[PDB]
Amino acid sequence: GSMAVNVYSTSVTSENLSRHDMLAWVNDSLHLNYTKIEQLCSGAAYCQFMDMLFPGCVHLRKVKFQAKLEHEYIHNFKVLQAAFKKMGVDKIIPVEKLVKGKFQDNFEFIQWFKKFFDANYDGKDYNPLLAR
């Protein structure tokens, strides 16, 4: 399969999305019910999005889908980091900041990730039940 297309500060991208529109995209894409951007700090949605982009790049059997504690969030980001390495994604994930559930760091990361997704997504169907 093809390697990831990286997104840089110099890459041409769409404009940033509002909190509402970003969550609408997450919810539609993954069949989720997120209401706060900070829910992305668990790492699980990122792992699923990587599977949707490049099926097989991520070890979804390791993903904690009902994570509630920092150590579980770090667990999921380890899974995400492995997927990034496998796909040649060169973006540094600020894991320590994200897992604290801080708004600013989580909002910046999802803005980048949406641009990354748009640069890479081929329109394939994604069954969110299969990983669960």
UniProtKB/Swiss-Prot annotation:
- Using the UniProt record, give the first listed, main subcellular location: cytoplasm
Q: Does the keyword Cytoplasm apply?
A: yes
Q: Which residues form the Calponin-homology (CH) domain?
A: 16-118
Q: Which residues form a coiled coil?
A: none
Compartments annotated for it: namely: Cytoplasm, Cytoskeleton
Tell me, what is an example of a GO biological process annotation in this record?
spindle assembly
Instruction: Describe, as the record does, how this protein assembles with itself and its partners.
Output: Homodimer. Heterodimer with MAPRE1. Binds monomeric and polymerized GTP-bound tubulin. Interacts with APC2. Interacts with DCTN1 and SRCIN1. Binds to the C-terminal domain of APC. Interacts (via C-terminus) with CLIP1. Interacts with SLAIN2 and SLAIN1. Interacts with AKAP9. Interacts with PDE4DIP. Interacts with PDE4DIP isoform 13/MMG8/SMYLE; this interaction is required for its recruitment to the Golgi apparatus.
User: What is the stated purpose of this protein?
Assistant: Plus-end tracking protein (+TIP) that binds to the plus-end of microtubules and regulates the dynamics of the microtubule cytoskeleton. Promotes microtubule growth. May be involved in spindle function by stabilizing microtubules and anchoring them at centrosomes. Also acts as a regulator of minus-end microtubule organization: interacts with the complex formed by AKAP9 and PDE4DIP, leading to recruit CAMSAP2 to the Golgi apparatus, thereby tethering non-centrosomal minus-end microtubules to the Golgi, an important step for polarized cell movement.
Which protein is depicted? Microtubule-associated protein RP/EB family member 3
Query: Whose protein is this, by species?
Result: Homo sapiens
Gene that this polypeptide is encoded by: MAPRE3
